[PDB]
Design a protein around this ligand. Structure first.
Ligand SMILES: CCCCCCCCO[C@@H]1[C@@H](O)[C@H](O)[C@@H](CO)O[C@H]1O
Ligand SMILES: [Zn+2]
Length: 793
DNA sequence: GCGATCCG
DNA sequence: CGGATCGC
């Protein structure tokens, strides 16, 4: 076999499907059952595959009205997939097919004709087989075993039969054999098709009592294999994915495009029955990225390289001890919502993350490390183990990373799954009432601005606003940052914008975010993804709910405990600064946290040489500002700017600050010193982050990297500390019948039963407070309440 | 000092 | 498509 040729009877499959699924249409009218039916059966054949694919069409009058519309889509689709389209003018589609089949077969190919019209069974041979839509491969064996015939005498058999419209009314019977129970029996000596006179009624009677009719039934052999055509059986070309998506989407069937990819999948590797060997990397494909709201379609597992596919995804999950592989945590969250407790084990995504945090998505790391993130469960599971091997062999030598992996990240994956799976209850009545309120407010703003501008210009349309501003007695980047002057209108628009963004980001999405099966929101939490090592949240991003602002507080208020439960919000007090005191070891900073005093007030004294009890507001504010600034950069230029009044005496403030805290500065120094030498910095626990730009050419960016270099150790250590705390806390939490729900900034929020709350709150405080030993003490401020704002921090 | 998820 | 706010 030089190759496999799949001849598709586009002509008839199109007609068939038009009368199949008859009601199907895109909710807008536009019927689509023919297009659908045709695509669906086409995929099946292509799943089975072939090298060349030729969909033959006819080259109208008393045919269906809407049929041509869908037929054009049929051809368009055929083309979009890279398959060949063939319609010879003045030739019936079946004659062309019979010939393509024969020519290819002669040319040493193996041919499979995707069709349903029984006529083609006459071509049927070794090498030439038929593929019926419904199913079954039709072969010569099939024919002899099911009909008792051979292709060479099937065109004949059917001649004296009829099927549909192959008109032949009147068969009689004879021994109740009719014509069907008969059929084969007249093969022994023709009569109708050459010699034989006297014979039994019907069989011969009806034969002669029906001239003309045979001179029509001849259509059965109307499968001439000798039509001279040129088309070559070349392999199907590259499918126009960009348009194919658009196509399927125009028809509303974009959602099934997933299967269309499943044909360009590289040659399959060895397989085995479902149950996989202990420790096989799993793979999976979901209907949507968000696991809680996802349909698990396809579960697979590779071990050794043999890939195993689960016949039944949703049940196979019970055959696994753990979900081990790319996106484990996500599979577990789903298994959890399926009443199955499937533990997330190893995951290449975690090892990759550790090696270098510029590894966040499974599409990225896979591409980076010699692979690709496909959509097939098998392919994915294979990639998964392959990656694991590779990334482990590296990380393994790394004793700091390896500790981080086994003790923090990997155990953290299981903790996250549960939070995602459990979720939080929202006060949707409060939420809806809130939306109603914020709405009126945005209005007030819109009005105010139109009042100033005069002309009721449609705000929220960059280009019209640009105009309006530039006559009010760009924006992106430039004036967006610079959207102010001695003008109230700019502020009014700025308040309108935030009230809207908060609205269209938290206030509105929230209700839909409530899962029907559980009655609560499931904020997705991600381990990798950030640059410092912090946990990012999505749907919603809790991280971006404004803190301390009335609107922010009003928003949090929506998250509530479960009826007879209370929420316990535990916040780490200045964890970043105590981490600084520790990392730098600046005995003064250390001293303050040790004495248990208001670091700001203290920093003020040592800066303005006055007793703690003498430090005035402006004093402590400068101190607080400097303190916060230390953490990310603040230059000096910013410092003054922020402190507003400081006329470059800001440099004075900084010097005084480092004078009191000399080691803090020595830390900045060393940090950058080693960083720009080693190529990276690290957190207290060895979490590595590369900052190549510390040696950047454009000082503008060399500045930025500087920031990151010391910023990562501090924020980074804080990130690790929390992750580890959650890892220790989780177990004891389940013991107490309590539950972890969120994690935002340096906070953790638990839901616990009524008065269990007090015990739970204390246990949590202790665990967190004593997570990991540090120079300065770790302080956890806890709050217990009914709504998130009740607990507060 | 830039990010993270959503806007529009 | 690409950019911004709250975030730390
Ligand atoms: C413990 C109390 C110590 C004294 C608190 C006030 C210190 C101010 O001391 C001065 C600053 O005024 C000046 O800006 C810089 C320039 O280097 O010199 C500092 O050392
Ligand atoms: Zn046909």
């Amino acid at each position: 076999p030089k190759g496999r040729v799949l001849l598709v009877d586009g002509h008839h499959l199109a007609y068939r499907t038009f009368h199949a699924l008859k009601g199907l249409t895109t909710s807008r009218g536009e019927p689509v059952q023919a297009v659908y039916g045709f695509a669906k059966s086409l995929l099946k054949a292509l799943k089975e595959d072939g090298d060349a694919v030729i969909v033959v069409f006819d080259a109208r009058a008393p045919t269906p009205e809407d049929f041509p519309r869908q037929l054009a889509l049929i051809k368009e689709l055929v083309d979009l997939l890279g398959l060949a389209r063939l319609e010879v003018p003045g030739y019936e589609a079946d004659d062309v097919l019979a010939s393509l089949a024969k020519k290819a077969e002669k040319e040493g190919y193996e041919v499979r004709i995707l069709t349903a019209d029984k006529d083609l069974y006459q071509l049927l041979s070794d090498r030439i087989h038929v593929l019926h839509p419904e199913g079954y491969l039709i072969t010569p064996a099939w024919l002899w075993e099911k009909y008792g015939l051979r292709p060479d005498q099937w065109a004949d058999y059917r001649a004296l039969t009829g099927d549909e419209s192959d008109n032949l009314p009147g068969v009689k019977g004879i021994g109740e054999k009719t014509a069907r129970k008969l059929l084969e029996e007249w093969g022994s000596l023709e009569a109708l098709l050459k010699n034989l006179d006297r014979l039994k009624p019907a069989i011969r009677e009806k034969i002669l009592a029906h001239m003309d009719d045979l001179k029509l039934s001849w259509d059965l052999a109307k499968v001439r294999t000798d039509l001279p055509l040129e088309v070559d059986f070349a392999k199907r070309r590259e499918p126009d994915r960009e348009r194919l998506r658009a196509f399927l989407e125009r028809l509303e069937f974009g959602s099934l495009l997933h299967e269309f990819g499943l044909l360009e999948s590289p040659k399959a590797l060895e397989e085995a029955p479902w149950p996989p060997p202990e420790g096989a990397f799993v793979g999976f494909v979901l209907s949507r990225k968000e696991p809680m709201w996802a349909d698990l379609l396809a579960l697979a597992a590779a071990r050794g390289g043999r890939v195993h596919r689960a016949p039944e995804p949703y049940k196979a999950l019970r055959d696994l001890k753990e979900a081990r592989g790319l996106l484990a945590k996500d599979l577990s969250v789903l298994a959890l919502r399926e009443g199955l407790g499937l533990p997330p084990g190893d995951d290449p995504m975690l090892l990759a993350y550790l090696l270098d945090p510029s590894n966040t998505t499974p599409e990225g790391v896979a591409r980076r490390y010699g692979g690709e993130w496909t959509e097939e469960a098998g392919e994915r599971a294979a990639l998964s183990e392959r990656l694991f091997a590779n990334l482990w062999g590296r990380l393994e030598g790394e004793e700091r990373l390896l500790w981080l992996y086994r003790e923090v990240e990997r155990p953290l994956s299981a903790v996250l799954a549960h939070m995602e799976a459990t979720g939080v209850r929202l006060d949707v009545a409060y939420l809806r009432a809130l939306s109603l309120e914020v709405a009126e407010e945005i209005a007030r703003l819109e009005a105010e601005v139109f009042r100033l501008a005069g002309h009721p210009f449609n705000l929220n349309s960059r280009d019209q606003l640009e105009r309006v501003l530039f006559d009010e007695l760009s924006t992106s980047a430039a004036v967006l940052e610079a959207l102010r002057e001695a003008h109230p209108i700019v502020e009014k628009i700025l308040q309108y914008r935030e009230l809207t963004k908060l609205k269209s980001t938290y206030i509105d999405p929230l209700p839909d975010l409530i899962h029907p099966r559980t009655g609560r929101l499931h904020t997705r939490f991600n381990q990798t993804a950030t640059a410092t090592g912090r946990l990012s949240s999505s749907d919603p991003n809790l991280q971006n709910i404004p803190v301390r602002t009335p609107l922010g507080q009003r928003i949090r208020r929506a998250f509530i405990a479960e009826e007879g439960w209370l929420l316990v919000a535990l916040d780490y007090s200045q964890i970043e600064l105590r981490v600084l005191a520790h990392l730098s070891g600046d005995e003064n900073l250390i001293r303050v946290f040790q004495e248990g005093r208001d670091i700001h007030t203290e920093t003020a004294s040592w800066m303005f040489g006055v007793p703690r009890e003498a430090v005035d507001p402006l004093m402590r504010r400068a101190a607080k500002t400097i303190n916060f600034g230390v953490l990310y950069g603040m230059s000096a230029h910013r410092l003054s700017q922020e402190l507003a009044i400081p006329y470059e005496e800001a440099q004075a403030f900084i010097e005084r600050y480092f004078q009191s805290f000399p080691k803090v500065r020595a830390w900045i120094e060393k940090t950058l010193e080693e960083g720009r030498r080693r190529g990276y910095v690290e957190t207290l626990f060895g979490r590595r982050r590369y900052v190549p730009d510390l040696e950047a050419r454009v000082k503008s960016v060399r500045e930025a990297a500087e920031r990151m270099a010391f910023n990562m150790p501090v924020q980074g250590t804080a990130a690790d500390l929390m992750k580890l705390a959650m890892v220790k806390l989780f177990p004891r939490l389940e013991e107490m019948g309590a539950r972890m729900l969120l994690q935002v900034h340096d906070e953790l929020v638990l839901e616990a039963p009524k008065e269990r709350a007090e015990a739970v709150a204390r246990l949590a405080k202790e665990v967190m407070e004593g997570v990991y030993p540090l120079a300065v003490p770790l302080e956890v401020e806890v709050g217990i309440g009914e709504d998130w704002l009740s607990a507060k921090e």
